[PDB]
Design a protein around this ligand. Structure first.
Ligand code: NY3
Lengths: 215, 215
């Protein structure tokens, strides 16, 4: 039960080349066969590569799979980008028994200029505390492409439980907005020195921190 | 070069049994293993059946796979149907020359109960005021069905500029979440006694109010 690690997102303009990596965690990449699946928004998945570099019939020559043994990774390289190439791409391999999927990479064929997110982190409101709630909100607006990943820290430990993040939506300025909220009890919020929201967009990561003591 | 044919959609009410078929166009259904995947929109898919009828751990035993050699099909049967089973389901098999997916079945669970939204209004953070911004966020969560309308007030008067509301998205609890944010200047925020966010859902309105606080 090993892991395959893919970038969360990639972008390029029409006619360019883009590459999506898939790094094996503990194992030997050439030990087992890697597949690549395309999923366009609102569509069924489609095999574009099997057995590391084989193209199914009807998949164009612009899709190419490869293996790097020294880096222990698989790559999908797409040349001559077209707007229809915009989709989620997932790598997949095998152990002695086990099937392992990568977490997926969103490929945007740029339809507008790139824009980095505005990120604002809010501490609990006085009113929700009296309701025994210490929900923190991380507002993420004015970004393009519409792909972000959010990670929360309690002090400096990753927080797993309590996190929700909305699907990015296009706003009146034609850029995306989303919010992530962490549903703390007041006891959990007071019991730490600070909490942090990390937002990754186009592989650039920003971090904001709030604390019970900040006046 | 065979195809797998599943219904586009199916609907059923809670506690009932639903069946999703997957018909192989050419060759025998039993010549290659069939997998079933569940996918909630915004999320990556999960494996619910492999090798025709094997369940990974963490998959409820309410999920069962089978083969019918005579109708040349595979079936996913979900018994004791629950709201969280609402999702897209894909079958998948092998061509030796390809990995083949069905077209996907969107399963609708009927008769989900109305749920009123939780509404939390956050005043500007100290850090954004120091960067000359006074954005308010109104976090709206746990509502069903997935539509609200938001109106903002400055003192008692309607706000007509600077409001954005995200498109509601279904969260892990199968209820919807959205944020409305009002992009104020520090001057606008301090020149009023309060701002209010008013959320309407299925005829009921909830109103929350925040005021500049003297730190
Ligand atoms: C769109 C492409 N696609 C096909 C529907 C994906 C795309 C991504 C995924 C991911 C990330 C997971 C979660 C991680 O799953 C795994 O690593 N393995 C799944 C699994 C678990 C147990 C048994 C099997 C299995 C399948 N055949 C034999 N054994 C597979 C997953 O389970 O399924 C995925 C399917």
């Amino acid at each position: 039960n090993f892991m395959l690690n893919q970038p969360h997102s990639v972008s390029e303009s029409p006619g360019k080349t883009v590459t999506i990596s898939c790094t094996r965690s503990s194992g030997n990449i050439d030990s087992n066969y890697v597949q690549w699946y395309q999923q366009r928004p609102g569509s069924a998945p489609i095999t574009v590569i099997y057995e590391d570099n084989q193209r199914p019939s009807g998949v164009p020559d612009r899709f190419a799979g490869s293996i790097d043994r020294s880096s222990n990774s698989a790559s999908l390289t797409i040349s001559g980008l077209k707007t229809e190439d915009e989709a989620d791409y997932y790598c997949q391999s095998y152990d002695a028994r086990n099937v392992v999927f990568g977490g997926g990479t969103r490929l945007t064929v740029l339809g507008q200029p790139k824009a980095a997110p505005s990120v604002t982190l809010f501490p609990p409101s006085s009113e929700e505390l009296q309701a025994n709630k210490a929900t923190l909100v991380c507002l993420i607006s004015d970004f393009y492409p519409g792909a972000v990943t959010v990670a929360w820290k309690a002090d400096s430990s990753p927080v797993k439980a309590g996190v929700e993040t909305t699907t990015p939506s296009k706003q009146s300025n034609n850029k995306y907005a989303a919010s992530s909220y962490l549903s703390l009890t007041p006891e959990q919020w007071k019991s730490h020195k600070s909490y942090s929201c990390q937002v990754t967009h186009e592989g650039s990561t920003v971090e904001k921190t709030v604390a019970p003591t900040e006046c």
